[model samples]
Target chain A: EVHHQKLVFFAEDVGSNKGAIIGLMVGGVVIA
Target chain B: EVHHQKLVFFAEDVGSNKGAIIGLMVGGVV
Candidate 1:
């Protein structure tokens, strides 16, 4: 549906040269 | 955007004696 809530994300990395820190975030809204 | 860096994620949970399974997926460009 066009009015359905969607997903979102945000992430970052710290103190690594071979690996990275990751995170997930989900939130959204629909309007006409 | 600086046009650099990479991001990706995936999750899964299996096996249960008395529990529930749930997952969330998210991906995009920034």
Candidate 2:
């Protein structure tokens, strides 16, 4: 059987560790 | 279900299963 992953997330300042916000700003985004 | 572990990916050379790139080849992948 093939299994696909489903990701569920909770939105909050404390939902993740300290680096999470940094990911949204810099890691996933790029500026030209 | 056979039980699957949803692992987050990271980058490391190799060791006790703690990364994405290292997990890719040394652990399991093409």
Candidate 3:
């Protein structure tokens, strides 16, 4: 196994005071 | 580390005959 730098995110309520976005990322990519 | 079933993708031209979608997914997590 190896590793990589990547992230995933999603956002909602744009242009609003209550708007928010959240996501998480990991560091790894490898399999064999 | 852990593993999960997840996917990530991006597409273009959804309403066209020439439109297409392509991506790859991996198995296992750390």
Candidate 4:
């Protein structure tokens, strides 16, 4: 079905690291 | 079982880029 889209969508962020560290930093500070 | 290998495999590339680009380009043109 659309499962392959999962990999495709992930492709956008596959090499992105800034978002990752930002997300991690936010996660650590956020109470949610 | 062996299925867990599916996600465990993705962990390595979660933050990787050059390889991803190469793989993507290969898939796109090849």
User: DockQ values for all predictions?
Assistant: 0.05, 0.05, 0.06, 0.08
Residue pairs in clash, model 3: A3-A28, A4-A28, B1-B30, B2-B30, B3-B29
For the predicted complex of model 2, DockQ is 0.05
Tens-place lDDT per residue, model 2, B1-30, is 542435344322322322121221112222
Candidate 3 per-residue lDDT, tens place, A1-32, comes to: 22343434333222333322223333344564
Residue B16 miss distance in model 2 (angstroms): 37
TM-score head-to-head 2 vs 3, winner: 2
Return the lDDT, model 1, position A16. 28
Quality of model 1 by C-alpha lDDT: 0.35
Off by over 4 Å in 2: A12-32, B1-30
lDDT of 3 at A32: 47
Candidate of highest DockQ: 4
**A1 in model 1: Cα distance from truth in Å?**
7.0
Residue A10 shift from truth in candidate 2, angstroms: 0.9
Q: Judging by TM-score against the true structure, name the best candidate.
A: 2
State every prediction's TM-score relative to the real structure: 0.21, 0.23, 0.21, 0.15
Worst 10 residues of 2 chain A by lDDT: A20-29
**Root-mean-square deviation of each candidate, in angstroms?**
14.1, 14.1, 11.4, 15.8
lDDT of 1 at A6: 32
